[PDB]
Design a protein around this ligand. Structure first.
Ligand SMILES: Nc1ncnc2c(CN3C[C@H](CO)[C@@H](O)C3)c[nH]c12
Ligand SMILES: Nc1ncnc2c(CN3C[C@H](CO)[C@@H](O)C3)c[nH]c12
Ligand SMILES: Nc1ncnc2c(CN3C[C@H](CO)[C@@H](O)C3)c[nH]c12
Ligand SMILES: Nc1ncnc2c(CN3C[C@H](CO)[C@@H](O)C3)c[nH]c12
Ligand SMILES: Nc1ncnc2c(CN3C[C@H](CO)[C@@H](O)C3)c[nH]c12
Ligand SMILES: Nc1ncnc2c(CN3C[C@H](CO)[C@@H](O)C3)c[nH]c12
Lengths: 238, 236, 227, 233, 231, 229
């Protein structure tokens, strides 16, 4: 029904977990959902709908980077009447106390893209996560006794950033981590009167080269997924 | 000890409430604080320190506009070793459902100022309220049975905005209200690894003319004031 | 009559002197104006109207910063029918040559604010002092034998400037001094077909009564000249 | 050996065709190459290496949008020593005489992204296709007798573009077609001394209104593949 | 000695009048200067040096546009050690009451060019005429009884302006007239601790060579005499 | 017919060669054109129209910098119904391999001007030479066995560039040369559904600091290209 989505109105739960890597979405469905149906596989994006603790949930990839999340998120919010998108991703740490495997929940997301300036008369849009979503995520992590840090992210357009000075600027202002998606997501939810959040697990540090193995990874990705899901259950009221 | 402040390190409590109107800072001090002391009156700014329910609090004006609050906020965080500034202000409603006398708590603030671009290599800084402060403010509002709305603010450099289409664009995106300070406060607190938040009472609507003829005013200021004072305690 | 001004049309004279410190404002009124009256104290801003050598003059605070002066200037030119604003302030010297207590007349003011670009389709607006005013101020100083430099100012949004290299660059281009207001004032005066100028006394160097009175005398004399 | 790419140096050929759709990637490998090995499937991206009419060729997805292609392309030119990339995607037509099924070769691409201004001191970078590639793409289209239009493209950050007056502005300036990638790619080619180009098939008109596709996309593919052969020598 | 100027240090006077039409520079030389000599004609730019009432003066073309004038102004002030440049051009009128062949003296110049942003860390540089020069032009006009308006100009990069709304905006803020040079000129003078100004005869109205041109030239030349005396 | 051009419609050929120096326009018309008539000398601009190998070709100065060429170019495409403009100029080399008296043909040109952002909703316009024209100039140079380099140029607003680090930046991206005109030219051509191109002779080097015989090579190529059109 869209160029990027073969599903119809109703095929998506009104809460969707989203991540960059479509194989992670497949994994989330195969691992945590009851009765998962493939609802969208246009461009291999792996969108599934099922339940978690009896409540309807959906999981899908959004591809890497703001332009990509901006396509999917808009479609979900407008065509498929989705109410909440929680991005579950990875990130690169900025703060010196945050390490690999750590978990981060974003209040907001800076960016170097021009997308919001196009949306917002060339002024400063504050890409902000839904207050609710943050709470839900913070409480889920507490209840699950998993430590989670709370603060600003940065959505870069350039994984390989030629501005080498930028990391330390972000560390001066106590940014927590870098990903490529959240600043595209937050204003879009605002635009549709809907809600959005972002929770991330740290995959590498950008201010030193760390130790990440070839599998773990998974163990901390698992916690993030668990928090996301419990939080998703709290949102649903109403 | 600064060009804008005749107090010495220690003269301010570690938590400070600020507002545009220095006469408002006077009122807060003369009304709510116990044993208040004038600690700074350079340029008639009205800086006071006392305690609230026995807890050290300070209050001071911050002028109108990002430049002004940027001077005072930085000085306070820097020289005076302040950990938390809550801005207690007024604002112009954007959202059709927020009405005069309603109380707004900001999660963050957008802006048309250039200050954060200057601070941040020409990129997009999200001026964000400190999560702890938003919580405290929301909790205190609940506790006191005062309805309070949570969301985005816009800090304008231009009260009389020659961009007439912008009011509606802000409304398209569900901005709650407009003031002139928060977008400059929030990053400064980050800089010093301190905390900041903004609570506001609605004094006008920028999308029609509404309830200016009302006497809250003080009954709505008072509510905001008490939410702010109570939140301040809860951050100590 | 405005959210920033309890006064009525006519409560202000056609000429207003403005400064950042409202405590300075009241001192000015008291020190120079016959029968001065408080005409606005919304936000402790201290606006007074009286006369000077028989001629009507107002004085009021404008707060620090472009957004603040923009509020007050527009209202005075708009609602209050003010014809001429002269900012009588302080400034941070830039030029290697300029010294603490020196008097500076701005011909224009550059800026790092975005306000002018928002007013002017994102192009470079030259915030220029009214030429008539610069004349009145320079002649005044000549007749009074007060030395006064004439040139560019820079209105900054960031008193504590994270751009540490900007001071040398302003020196390189012979900017005379830094304040935080003029660049906002001048474009507004043009907008209303009115006049504006700024005169400063140096208080500090960003690189390396006496003057206060001289500045006041200069401004007040110039105000007579522009009738 | 990169976080987006499990392959080692040499696993990719010197010439790499790229598209947005990693399923279209897979399909090209299966359809056009002999003995296609899968060399990278990190994030489902479908990187294949085989040969076509003898010479070595690779094919991989690049996701949608500048930030995505910038990741892959840099990695390809940098780690995997790739010499030539030809993007073989789709596009939204702008010009009034460009229709669905029609095939466009881009000389350059403009953009509303800020990427290039970040690379190029906040000035204007002309994201230009490599002169070789464009010739080759055109030469091939003549040889294979395929009608192909040459000119400017536009790479957008914003598929659902809130600036609705931009489409006509691009018509005014005779921009052929919109996609989301070339503006990112080309400057990177430049940066590593390498070469890039773009051929696209029209999937929609942005100024008005499943099987060709397998005719015009079929045609596009032949032009690209034949051009690749001319370039690897 | 420069890529755009065959002359050597000393060949130009400390005061130089510049216009954009090189054919005009030749006429000015003939019409006003005693013993004018060709000093530079790289690119047909018609550079001349003579005296006017016994005080040394030069006149050169500067071509149209900010990039051109920036080249010529920087060379004069650095290589040729010029102290004062006065642009004596034409301009299209903006203000409703400024009419064809009126005389405008610019206090400053707005611009749609990025040049001053590039020079000044992407902030607002106010391309301001040197106060002395402005004063010398004003006084001269009063001395000669020539009415002359005073206020801001705008230097465009786009003679044919695709931003059709821009003229009316400029009118809103009381810009007097448009040219294509002064915004380049002013900041360069400042860079070299020198002086610049611009005087303009209105040739057209964007909203709605012996008389006005003669008058502009006298004011520019009489002002050139006042400057030089201090210093 | 215009503030800068005295000629009427018909006076210019469909193809015009344009340079910065009017003394070169003059020297080109005298040398390569048969029966050159001076069609426009407003502001000393030196506009001629003749024939070459039996075909109408004009030649005119365009001044220095984008603002100037943007006036002339838009008048020629607009009032004079010109179809093709080939700029034949000088340029300072950027790439460490390119040298004095080399001949660069521009595919496209970057700029530090604001002119294209004004024209283009504050986005990035690729000032691209017309593909036909680049072919023609490339083909013509084979024929005459003259080495021609092909790629990106850069039009600066500032000959004396206070951005001292820019030169290397351009080298890091293998920009061949800097001039001051092509970035203005190309989008006007597009705007008028017309064609433009640009070819230069290298007069200086901006990173590691005749005329004639390289200028002849340049002139021959451009004229030869003009024929193929
Ligand atoms: N170093 C670094 N930079 C930017 N982003 C990330 C991320 C987060 N996501 C990974 C994907 C790109 O590798 C993109 O979706 C953001 C992990 N480490 C990162
Ligand atoms: N309409 C409108 N615009 C900008 N700001 C405000 C405010 C908040 N503050 C009041 C002061 C200006 O009136 C300034 O401190 C912002 C209330 N209504 C406003
Ligand atoms: N160093 C420095 N920077 C910016 N401005 C000033 C001023 C002028 N006014 C003083 C107020 C702040 O100290 C501000 O309104 C401008 C004096 N020294 C200054
Ligand atoms: N209308 C429109 N806009 C932007 N791009 C395209 C494309 C080309 N690609 C398809 C993907 C978006 O659907 C993106 O990778 C570019 C076809 N039609 C498009
Ligand atoms: N309408 C209009 N626009 C921009 N500039 C001018 C000028 C001033 N000079 C004329 C030259 C262009 O014709 C240029 O050098 C500036 C006169 N009328 C003008
Ligand atoms: N170093 C350098 N910078 C900018 N441009 C050029 C040119 C090319 N043209 C010569 C004229 C400036 O001297 C201008 O038309 C561009 C040769 N060398 C140049």
């Amino acid at each position: 029904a869209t160029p990027h989505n073969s599903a119809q109105v109703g095929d998506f739960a009104e809460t969707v977990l989203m991540c960059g890597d479509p194989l992670r979405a497949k994994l989330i469905a195969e691992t945590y959902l009851e009765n998962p149906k493939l609802v969208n596989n246009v461009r291999g994006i792996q969108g599934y709908t099922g339940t978690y603790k009896g409540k309807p949930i959906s999981v899908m990839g959004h591809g890497m980077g703001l332009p990509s999340i901006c396509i999917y998120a808009e479609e979900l919010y407008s065509t498929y009447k989705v109410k909440t998108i929680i991005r579950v991703g990875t990130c690169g740490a900025i703060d010196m106390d945050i390490h690999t495997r750590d978990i981060v929940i974003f209040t907001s997301a800076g960016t170097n893209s021009k997308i919001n300036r196009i949306r917002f008369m060339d002024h400063d849009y504050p890409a902000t996560a839904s207050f609710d979503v943050v709470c839900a995520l913070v409480d889920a992590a507490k209840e699950l006794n998993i430590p989670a840090k709370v603060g600003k992210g940065f959505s870069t357009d350039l994984f390989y950033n030629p501005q080498t000075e930028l990391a330390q600027l972000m560390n001066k202002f106590h940014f927590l981590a870098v990903e490529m998606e959240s600043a595209g997501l937050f204003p879009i939810a605002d635009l549709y009167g809907a809600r959005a959040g972002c929770i991330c697990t740290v995959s590498d540090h950008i201010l030193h080269h760390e130790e990440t193995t070839a599998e773990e990874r998974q163990n901390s990705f698992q916690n993030m997924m668990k928090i996301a899901l419990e939080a998703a259950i709290k949102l649903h009221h109403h």
